[PDB]
Structures are given as structure tokens and as C-alpha cells.
């Protein structure tokens, strides 16, 4: 039951970042810290609480003892956007902590929202996919609610999110609602409602089945 705090944080380039770890036992072997960037392998940055691996920049440091450890980035750089993990060796096992995801803080950007009905070519095969796009928003937190004739849909959608854009620091999100053709043709109004802190009120995009 190792912990890390916070689970995610946003900071600007040049900000101090502080990430904490709680080991599951009073440490009796090394407490190490790793950096993992999107799509890449983990990299050791700090070993034995505070020692920098050869070649790691001076802005990284660590401290602690007992069960409580802290990893610091003195001045966040764009290349430091990553997930950071602490790691213990206790009870004859290596254990990695749950990780702390760091992204870039920028100004709030509300999503631009788009809904896409199922194509007639898809409906020929017996399934309907309805897609809702949330484009170029910040921060990451956003909620999509699907409604069909005013019935809230749960369990029948999936979503995914892009990595933070390297140039504008935004995210985008795609959600797909899937139903059978038979179910699709029993209902009229398909709606995606988006909640985000940049929107005064939630935005709803909708269509009526069969309309141009």
C-alpha cells in the first residue's frame, strides 16, 4: 500500500514541483525515483533517496527517511512532463508507487464540441456508433453525458484522450456511444452534454435521427 501525493498536478515552466511518497514499511533498502514519458521506457533519476544518476540535471533532487520521501523539480522544464514513480525493495519484493502525473498549466480553454451521427454504411451492418468530440480544452477534467430521448446512457460508451499538445498545451477527447441498429431506430434525439470549468453552462450537441 505505497502512496504518492498528489496523483496529478499541473505546473508552469519554471515552477517548483514537489511530489511525495509514503513507503509501505520503514525503509530497509534503497528508495528510488523513476521518470516515464508518454510512450517511452522508465528512467532512473534518483537512487538511495537523494543521489542523482550520472547525467541527470541538477534541478532534480530527493530527500526523506523512514517512510516519508519527497522528490523535487526546482524549476519545471517542458521536457519534464512525465509520470514519476517512487520504488522500494521490502519483504523481498520491488514495489513501485502509484505514480504522479505532471502536465503543463496553461489558461483555461473551453472545449469546442461536435457530434457525429452513425453513417448509413455502418447501419447496413447492424450497429450504430455515435461520436462526440471535445476539441482543444484545458484543464484535462471534462465530463461527457450521453442522452437518448432524455434517458441518461451508462455502460455503453467509451472514451479516450490525447496527450497534452506540445505547442498549445490542450487536450482533446473522443467518446463513442454504441447501440444496436434496432435500438438506434427506436429513438429520436441523440445528445452529448459536456461539462467543463471553462463553460458557463454545459454545452449540448444533438441530432434527430434521419435528419440531414
Amino acid at each position: 500500500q505505497m502512496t504518492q501525493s498528489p496523483s496529478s498536478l499541473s505546473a508552469s515552466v519554471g515552477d517548483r514541483v514537489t511530489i511525495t511518497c509514503q513507503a509501505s514499511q520503514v525503509i530497509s533498502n534503497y528508495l528510488n525515483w523513476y521518470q516515464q514519458k508518454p510512450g517511452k521506457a522508465p528512467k532512473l533519476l534518483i537512487y538511495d533517496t537523494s543521489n542523482l544518476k550520472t547525467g541527470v540535471p541538477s534541478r532534480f533532487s530527493g530527500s526523506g527517511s523512514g517512510t516519508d520521501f519527497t522528490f523535487t523539480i526546482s524549476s519545471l522544464q517542458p521536457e519534464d512532463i512525465a509520470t514519476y514513480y517512487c520504488q522500494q525493495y521490502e519483504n523481498l519484493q520491488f514495489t513501485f508507487g502509484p505514480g504522479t502525473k505532471v502536465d503543463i498549466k496553461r489558461t483555461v480553454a473551453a472545449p469546442s464540441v461536435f457530434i457525429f451521427p452513425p453513417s448509413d454504411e455502418q447501419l447496413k451492418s447492424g450497429t450504430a456508433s455515435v461520436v462526440c468530440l471535445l476539441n482543444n480544452f484545458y484543464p484535462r477534467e471534462a465530463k461527457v453525458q450521453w442522452k437518448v430521448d432524455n434517458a441518461l446512457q451508462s455502460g455503453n460508451s467509451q472514451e479516450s484522450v490525447t496527450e497534452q499538445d506540445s505547442k498549445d498545451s490542450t487536450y482533446s477527447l473522443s467518446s463513442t456511444l454504441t447501440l444496436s441498429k434496432a435500438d438506434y431506430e427506436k429513438h429520436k434525439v441523440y445528445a452529448c452534454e459536456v461539462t467543463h470549468q471553462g463553460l458557463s453552462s454545459p454545452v449540448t450537441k444533438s441530432f434527430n435521427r434521419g435528419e440531414c
Binding site: 533498502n29 534503497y30 528510488n32 523513476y34 516515464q36 521506457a41 522508465p42 528512467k43 532512473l44 537512487y47 538511495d48 544518476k53 509520470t83 514513480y85 520504488q87 525493495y89 523481498l92 519484493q93 520491488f94 514495489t95 513501485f96 508507487g97 502509484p98 505514480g99 469546442s112 461536435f114 457525429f116 452513425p118 453513417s119 454504411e121 455502418q122 451492418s125 456508433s129 461520436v131 468530440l133 476539441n135 467509451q158 472514451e159 479516450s160 484522450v161 490525447t162 482533446s172 473522443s174 463513442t176 454504441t178 440531414c212
Partner: protein, 222 residues
Amino acid sequence: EVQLVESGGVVVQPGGSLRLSCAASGFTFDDYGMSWVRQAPGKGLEWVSLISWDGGSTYYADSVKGRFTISRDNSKNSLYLQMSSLRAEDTALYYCASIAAAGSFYYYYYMDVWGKGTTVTVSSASFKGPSVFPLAPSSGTAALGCLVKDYFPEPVTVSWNSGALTSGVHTFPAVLQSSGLYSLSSVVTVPSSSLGTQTYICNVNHKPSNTKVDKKVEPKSC
């Protein structure tokens, strides 16, 4: 250069067996213990097994004990992971890492060298090329895209206009559906003024099924 290279990750049926390999180069392999660490899609790092320098000691995470066996052949600079009784939750990227030892009596450890990983997919699905459906621009800025639905296994690639269109493109991570097939969307935002004139074609390639598709996306015919 010091390096570790994993291989052997493929699709394997639930209940099945698979052996992964890790080749070491550029250092004295038998001076180091070795570890396997895995990462399930979208999840954190999970250490799973380790082995001492000569193979005389092995250890496992409770999640894999009794199903996985770590071994090494120092004459071949190779580390292996034999997996058996595989489960959907064993689907992951598997990394090998060397165990550096230091401090008093060399009792203290860190994992300093890592490979790039090999991918294990535990599934009973068989190969399927995608169906590519339009996300038609609605009737300023318009959005359009392609829905790349119902393929197996990963990965697919998507380009727009043969790579000439990159600005405003977002290709999303795939999702694994409850059918066992993947789906992915790729979108682009473009000037509404362009919808009458400019052609938009998504180029989809699914090598595991030998499927290339070019899909033109336009406003709906009403």
C-alpha cells in the same frame, strides 16, 4: 553501448503459455541480477519477477507466483520469462531491467538499465481488419474524421491526405471493446470555407490483417 532488448510478446489465448526473452549486450551480464516489470494499458508500473546473477535465487509478485518462471542463460546473455495460465489482466508491456547492487556488502538495489519492452496481448480474438466509417462534417471551423472500428490486434496507423494534412489532426488512443475488438477515431478541424473545395482522405493501414484503406470523408448526401 549497454543495452537490453525484449522480444516474444504476441497474441496468446487465455489459459495459454508464452516465453519472453531479453538479450543483454555491452556489459558483463552475469555480474547483475535482473528484473521483469510490466505495465498494463493506461496503468502504472508493476514489478513481477527477479533473478540473481547465477539463477540460484528467484522471486515473484503475488500476482504472478505459481504461473510465471524467470530463468537466465548466462552463456547466451539471455533472460527469459515463461508465462503460463495466462489471464486477460496479464496483457501488458513487459520490460526487462538490470539490478545494480551497491552499498554495504552489495545488498542495496536500483534498476538502472531498461529495455524498450515487448507487448503481450492475452485474447481469444482472431485477426480482423478495420471498417473505416466517416465522421462527416456537419451541415469558421468544421470538424470531420474517420472511425476505424472493429480491428484486432493493435496497431493501426492513420494519416490524412497521404501525410500532407497534419495541422489540427488528433488521432486518439484506441479503446478495447467488450467484443475483444479495438476501435479508434482520428479527427481534423479545418476551415468550413474549405468543405466545398478541399478533399479529405484518411489513409488507414492495419498490417496484422494486410488491410490498407483510403476513406474519403465529405458532407452527407441528403
